[PDB]
From Swiss-Prot, chain A:
Shown segment, full-protein numbering: 354 to 361 of 372
Family: Belongs to the protein kinase superfamily. CAMK Ser/Thr protein kinase family. Tribbles subfamily.
Superkingdom to which the source organism belongs: Eukaryota
Signal peptide annotation: none
Species this protein is from: Homo sapiens (Human)
Entry's free-text remark on domains: The protein kinase active site is incompatible with ATP binding and is inactive.
Identification of the protein by name: Tribbles homolog 1
Purpose: Adapter protein involved in protein degradation by interacting with COP1 ubiquitin ligase. The COP1-binding motif is masked by autoinhibitory interactions with the protein kinase domain. Serves to alter COP1 substrate specificity by directing the activity of COP1 toward CEBPA. Binds selectively the recognition sequence of CEBPA. Regulates myeloid cell differentiation by altering the expression of CEBPA in a COP1-dependent manner. Controls macrophage, eosinophil and neutrophil differentiation via the COP1-binding domain.
Curated annotation (Swiss-Prot), chain B:
Subcellular location: Nucleus; Cytoplasm
Subunit structure, interactors included: Homodimer. Interacts with HY5, HYH, BBX24/STO, BBX25/STH, CIP8, COP10, SPA1, SPA2, SPA3, SPA4 and UVR8 and phosphorylated PHYA. Light induces dissociation of the SPA1/COP1 complex. Interacts with HRT/RPP8 and triggers it to the 26s proteasome. Binds to CRY2; this competitive interaction prevents triggering to proteasome of other binding proteins. Binds to SHW1 in the nucleus. Bonds to CIP7. Interacts with CSU2. Binds to CIP1. Interacts directly with DHU1. Associates to UNE10/PIF8. Binds directly to PCH1 and PCHL.
Full-protein positions shown: 354 to 674 of 675
Post-translational modification: Autoubiquitinated.
Function field: E3 ubiquitin-protein ligase that acts as a repressor of photomorphogenesis and as an activator of etiolation in darkness. E3 ubiquitin ligases accept ubiquitin from an E2 ubiquitin-conjugating enzyme in the form of a thioester and then directly transfers the ubiquitin to targeted substrates. Represses photomorphogenesis in darkness by mediating ubiquitination and subsequent proteasomal degradation of light-induced transcription factors such as HY5, HYH and LAF1. Down-regulates MYB21, probably via ubiquitination process.
Consequence recorded when altering W114A: No interaction with HY5, BBX24/STO and BBX25/STH and at low light intensity shorter hypocotyl
Organism lineage: Eukaryota, Viridiplantae, Streptophyta, Embryophyta, Tracheophyta
Name this protein carries in UniProt: E3 ubiquitin-protein ligase COP1
More about this protein: Plants lacking COP1 are not viable.
WD repeats: 16-55, 65-105, 108-148, 150-190, 194-232, 235-274, 289-321
Site (Human TRIB1 COP1-binding motif): K69, Y88
Region (Binding of human TRIB1 COP1-binding-motif): 240-242
Species this protein is from: Arabidopsis thaliana
Amino acid sequence: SDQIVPEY
Amino acid sequence: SRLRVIAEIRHGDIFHSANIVSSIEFDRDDELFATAGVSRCIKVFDFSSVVNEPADMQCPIVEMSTRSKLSCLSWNKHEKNHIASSDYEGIVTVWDVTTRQSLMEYEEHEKRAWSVDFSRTEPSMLVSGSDDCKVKVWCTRQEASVINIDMKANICCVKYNPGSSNYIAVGSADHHIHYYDLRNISQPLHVFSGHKKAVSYVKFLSNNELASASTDSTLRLWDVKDNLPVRTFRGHTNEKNFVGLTVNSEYLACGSETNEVYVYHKEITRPVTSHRFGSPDMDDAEEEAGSYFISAVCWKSDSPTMLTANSQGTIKVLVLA
């Protein structure tokens, strides 16, 4: 999906 | 402590396609504003026309079709008609909204670029950040990047200090804000920690006051001169999406995954008011059940007036009263 904040 | 709608724009194939607005920004004089998003176009609107025309008429004065989905816009602060975009292929483009043509394309990022920002005080300089874990500084006079910063995690947001082109705030997926002096990128000047998830936005209230947003459902305020955490703001829901952050000298405003715009005063940790997007014809094009989110916000620089847009492509002009 679009405009999802990346996770780390 | 109330938000009021003074204009509403639904333009495009709203009911049959994806129309997330990833970015909404006023130009240098708050006269035009532009939107970009997953519909692969940059729209430019005349603010005065928007707030004075009748509804079901609102349309952009300019629409520029793009190759890829867009993540961010930044107007140039000196060439009023120039505007930069970042897109999902990594490309950073500078456009002329009067001729509707691209002026320059920067194609060094290897992955989706999330953010671009034109410097106010050195207006030929443009900074970008990307999933490729790089920050790149571009000069419109040159074809190759002039500075490159190799970072450890996805870069979600970049912003120039409003008083000096030698400093940038960088929001990382490692949950920290990295505050760089671009004259010596060997290490960041300061690292601000406290967020529990990626830092999705960074915006300056002033030369020394920095706000951040994160998918830990907080906004945070920092002092980049004194190297201090200042305040934490809670009350909105933001655990997943880019929902927008905009600040002025006194207020912070952000989106939420409940289709709500929130406003915080910078001294108070709970929201002062909020506005809820949504409509009967979108309730049962079904799913304001949880799916719709605010996706971009932008204060007018000289008024408590706010541009707002959400994941269904609705644009509203709000006023704070």
